[PDB]
Amino acid sequence: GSQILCVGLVVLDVISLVDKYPKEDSEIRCLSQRWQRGGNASNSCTVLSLLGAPCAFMGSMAPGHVADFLVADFRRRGVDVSQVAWQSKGDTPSSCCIINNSNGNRTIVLHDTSLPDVSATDFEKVDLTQFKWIHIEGRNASEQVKMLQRIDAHNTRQPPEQKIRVSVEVEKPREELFQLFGYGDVVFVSKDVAKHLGFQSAEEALRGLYGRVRKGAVLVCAWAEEGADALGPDGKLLHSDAFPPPRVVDTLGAGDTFNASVIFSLSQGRSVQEALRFGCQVAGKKCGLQGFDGIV
Amino acid sequence: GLVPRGSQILCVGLVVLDVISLVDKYPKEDSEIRCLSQRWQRGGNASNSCTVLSLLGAPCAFMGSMAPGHVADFLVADFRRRGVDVSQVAWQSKGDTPSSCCIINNSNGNRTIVLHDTSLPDVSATDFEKVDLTQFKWIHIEGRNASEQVKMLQRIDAHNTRQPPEQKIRVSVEVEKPREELFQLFGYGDVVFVSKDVAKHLGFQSAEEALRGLYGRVRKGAVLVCAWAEEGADALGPDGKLLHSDAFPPPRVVDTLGAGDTFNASVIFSLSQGRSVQEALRFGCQVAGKKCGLQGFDGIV
Numbered sequence A: 001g002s003q004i005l006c007v008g009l010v011v012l013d014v015i016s017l018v019d020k021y022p023k024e025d026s027e028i029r030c031l032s033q034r035w036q037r038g039g040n041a042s043n044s045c046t047v048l049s050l051l052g053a054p055c056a057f058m059g060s061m062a063p064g065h066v067a068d069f070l071v072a073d074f075r076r077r078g079v080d081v082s083q084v085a086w087q088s089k090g091d092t093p094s095s096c097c098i099i100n101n102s103n104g105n106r107t108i109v110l111h112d113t114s115l116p117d118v119s120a121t122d123f124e125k126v127d128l129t130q131f132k133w134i135h136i137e138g139r140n141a142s143e144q145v146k147m148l149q150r151i152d153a154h155n156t157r158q159p160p161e162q163k164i165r166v167s168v169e170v171e172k173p174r175e176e177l178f179q180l181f182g183y184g185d186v187v188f189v190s191k192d193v194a195k196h197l198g199f200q201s202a203e204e205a206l207r208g209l210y211g212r213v214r215k216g217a218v219l220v221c222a223w224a225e226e227g228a229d230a231l232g233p234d235g236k237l238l239h240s241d242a243f244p245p246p247r248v249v250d251t252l253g254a255g256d257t258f259n260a261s262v263i264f265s266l267s268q269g270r271s272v273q274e275a276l277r278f279g280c281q282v283a284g285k286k287c288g289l290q291g292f293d294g295i296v
Numbered sequence B: 001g002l003v004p005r006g007s008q009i010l011c012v013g014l015v016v017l018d019v020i021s022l023v024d025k026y027p028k029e030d031s032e033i034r035c036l037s038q039r040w041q042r043g044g045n046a047s048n049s050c051t052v053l054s055l056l057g058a059p060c061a062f063m064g065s066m067a068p069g070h071v072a073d074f075l076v077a078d079f080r081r082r083g084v085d086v087s088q089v090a091w092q093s094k095g096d097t098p099s100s101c102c103i104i105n106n107s108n109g110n111r112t113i114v115l116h117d118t119s120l121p122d123v124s125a126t127d128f129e130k131v132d133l134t135q136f137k138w139i140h141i142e143g144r145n146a147s148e149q150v151k152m153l154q155r156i157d158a159h160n161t162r163q164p165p166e167q168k169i170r171v172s173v174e175v176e177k178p179r180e181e182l183f184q185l186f187g188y189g190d191v192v193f194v195s196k197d198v199a200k201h202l203g204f205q206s207a208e209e210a211l212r213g214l215y216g217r218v219r220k221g222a223v224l225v226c227a228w229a230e231e232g233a234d235a236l237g238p239d240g241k242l243l244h245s246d247a248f249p250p251p252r253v254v255d256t257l258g259a260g261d262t263f264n265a266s267v268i269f270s271l272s273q274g275r276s277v278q279e280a281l282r283f284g285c286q287v288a289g290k291k292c293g294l295q296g297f298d299g300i301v
């Protein structure tokens, strides 16, 4: 096991950088525009790569000129595309991403393209010996749950010296996804999921959702400018203050940067208190830059 | 390839990649939403007039600024899908190929637009100086960078001076945006198109008031054209006889986006085919009418 595997989406992020958020029925010229390789798991691969950690992306891609761009970006970053479930039917998904340059706020208008998701079938064809860690971005829950059981089964037939650490992300407030809570050594729950379930703080959410997690797991919840908090088996709550930049110019992928940084510090054998802190650290550096270049 | 001498209609102006997303409700800042539908279109006045001229059966070229990249590529493949000659494109070293994001609310029907950056440089008179004009029979300039386009227009005037009356490149100019800079373009070309919106800004309540009031701004022997949507279009020439065509509306109105560009291209085509100004006005109103009850330009002819 020498690589980190992120299992999720890869989306073309068509970015427009605005000085102020547009008002409805308004016509307002943008400051600048760019194309960016997106998708939560795809973004985490950019981050992991920049931290110096060898990694691989797993997700569905439809061949064309868009995927040609995406593949070229992944490669320039050293992301192992070898595990991509190439589809015949469907188009590559794209998002219109408006980044408010004044506060760094990002608004995403995603276009889902019928492109079939990576299945337990696609995952079954994967050589689990090259991976140190496996991160799954919560999309097709029932199917991903089968993929989780396949990693768990591999682990049971392996010494503790060679076990695959697993991490899950529950970003979208969807009931299907609450079953993934659930599985994995580390569980990232978003502020939006937490708020939808009735929680007003990262600590409230953590105490309220720790019953849901797998025995021995760490449930992590970041909370924008309020940093992030983690809850382990020991019952002790852990907290990290955020590392805000003086000028917050781009939050698109900040969470994906947080996730990756937490995964990396844990993969490096550092404490949960240290990992939480490094996640907030690297995520904060990103919010002061456009894109991902210059985070380290 | 070998373009035959005096065969092409050139259109000089904007090409933009319009990304259109139809949504249930308008997205609130910092949220992640999913659109109902999403389209990638090739926009721009000179760009749309080129599509229409191809469908009309005319050899046509586009001259506009583009930066090598992925946006330029999608835009070049749409031009080619529509038989437009992209050989005269002014490829830029710096700047972003124009791309706009449109958000259409399903309920109210309101259009929210995040216009392309001002980063890419427009076509210059030095860019235009390098063009061997002999393949063109008509050149249409969309009003943008007026000072520069004036020199372009002067070069065609210079070119024409040494040509017999039948080897003379006919010229048309479009003043569609209410910008003072553009009002100098009125004194150029054989055909001048003025928009309802430009006319309204100058304080004219009809196409009759616009033509009569603005004809003094045009050169000797020029035709000043003004369309007024549902009220059809007018044309006024050196004779002083105000001509009019009533609109030919479709049974149901589907898409008015590019209807002005369809009108412009059809008037240009009909005139370039040797037809009367009355015939051109009629034809432009007919073609533009059929487009309004159609999505895109697919079945306009």
Ligand SMILES: N#Cc1c(C(F)(F)F)cc(N2CCN(CCO)CC2)nc1N1CCC[C@H](CO)C1
Pocket: A103, A104, A105, A222, A223, A224, A225, A226, A227, A228, A242, A243, A244, A245, A248, A251, A254, A255, A256, A258, A279, A280, A283, A284, A287, B030
């Ligand atoms: N780091 C960071 C971070 C920052 C900060 F500038 F504070 F750095 C701002 C922010 N914003 C979202 C809410 N906006 C509301 C405006 O009214 C402000 C911008 N989101 C952050 N993220 C989101 C991923 C996880 C990461 C965990 O620390 C927290």
Ligand SMILES: N#Cc1c(C(F)(F)F)cc(N2CCN(CCO)CC2)nc1N1CCC[C@H](CO)C1
Pocket: B227, B228, B229, B230, B232, B233, B247, B248, B249, B250, B253, B256, B257, B259, B260, B261, B263, B284, B285, B288, B289, B290, B292
């Ligand atoms: N036929 C026709 C016609 C109709 C209608 F179907 F209602 F009759 C509506 C309409 N518009 C209304 C909405 N405007 C909003 C966007 O600016 C665009 C113009 N314009 C039309 N014409 C016909 C003459 C030429 C003119 C060129 O602009 C295009």
